[PDB]
């Protein structure tokens, strides 16, 4: 839930890259592997951060108060 700032393994900021990744997929139709790489996420530790994220926050927002 909610994109991790910084990759656990090396600590490369990954907090900014979320919307940008989600955009390179809808708007650019691009496959996951290219979008990640476009965003400069080269090490698999960094790749796994975005590639395997589950943004549960968006469901959480669906409840009123």
């Amino acid at each position: 839930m909610i994109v991790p700032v910084r990759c656990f393994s090396c600590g490369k900021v990954v907090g900014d890259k979320w919307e940008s990744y989600l955009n390179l997929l809808q708007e650019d139709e691009l496959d996951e592997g290219t979008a990640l790489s476009r965003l400069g996420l080269k090490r698999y530790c960094c790749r796994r951060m975005i590639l395997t994220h589950v943004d549960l926050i968006e469901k959480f927002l669906r409840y009123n108060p």
């Binding site: 700032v5 919307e19 926050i57």
Partner: protein, 263 residues
């Protein structure tokens, strides 16, 4: 020029590729260690929460705020609060950040590292600015709010090192390799048929001479020449990760010389 030598291969805001020749592996490593652990940085350390109507916990958010990179260029002219003479914090030892956010929009309202505002006097020094590398210029996404979702908090950023917390880590991964042809026999290659065919050739193989099979094993041979890549997070510029790393290790050694002196 003199002793150990550098030969930069590539540069950017975020990366330094170089070759370190005429050095002890022990030295190359000790520098590598320091860059990761002992270079000081500014990072949020106390978070006073006035209001939080969010789907996230006070401390969940608090944790993230520490991982947000802050401008630590002039970190050297800021004091560690521990060493400072006040009661808790002050200007001489901290940067005060403020964050007020509210879901005015019917649509989801986002909270970014850009939404942070400095409230403390900076003494005109390059410090505490949330690092924005983001194309759209937003920086780190801290939170998401809906309607009456308010987030009102205060951050106290302090000077620190990665040994205390990894948030004060100015460097991302540091690449480090030597002897791309295993001339030193420092590894026994695991294989099934051929270690040469099975194991991928390094980039750096091009920057060294292949061993040529019709030669005896060089036992006398020692490890010098290190192919490294230093990646910055933002707090300090790539070059200064290297320089400050060299300097920290130098200062660290000086302390020992000085300790002996007092003894």
């Amino acid at each position: 020029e003199e002793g150990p030598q550098v030969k930069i291969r590539e540069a950017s805001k975020d990366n330094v590729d170089f070759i370190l020749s005429n050095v002890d592996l022990a030295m190359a490593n000790s520098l590598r260690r320091v860059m990761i652990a002992e270079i000081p940085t500014l990072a949020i350390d106390s978070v006073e929460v006035e209001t939080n109507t969010t789907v996230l916990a006070d401390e969940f958010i608090a944790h993230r705020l520490g991982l947000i990179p802050l401008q630590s260029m002039d970190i050297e002219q800021l004091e560690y609060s521990r060493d400072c003479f006040c009661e808790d914090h002050c200007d001489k030892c901290s940067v005060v950040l403020t964050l007020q956010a509210f879901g005015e929009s019917e649509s989801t309202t986002n909270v970014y590292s850009k939404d942070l505002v400095i409230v403390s006097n900076l003494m005109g020094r390059n410090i505490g600015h949330p690092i924005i590398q983001d194309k759209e210029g937003n920086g780190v996404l801290i939170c998401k709010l809906r309607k009456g979702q308010e987030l009102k908090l205060t951050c106290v950023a302090k000077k620190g090192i990665a040994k205390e917390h990894a948030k004060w880590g100015p460097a991302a991964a540091i690449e480090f390799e030597y002897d791309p042809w295993n001339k030193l026999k420092h590894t026994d290659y695991w294989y099934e048929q051929d270690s040469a065919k099975e194991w991928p050739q390094s980039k750096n193989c091009e920057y060294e001479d292949p061993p040529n099979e019709g030669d005896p094993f060089d036992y006398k041979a020692q490890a010098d020449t290190f192919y490294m890549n230093v990646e910055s997070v933002g707090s300090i510029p790539v070059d200064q990760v290297v320089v400050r790393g060299i300097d920290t290790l130098q200062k660290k050694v000086a302390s020992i010389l000085l300790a002996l002196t007092q003894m």
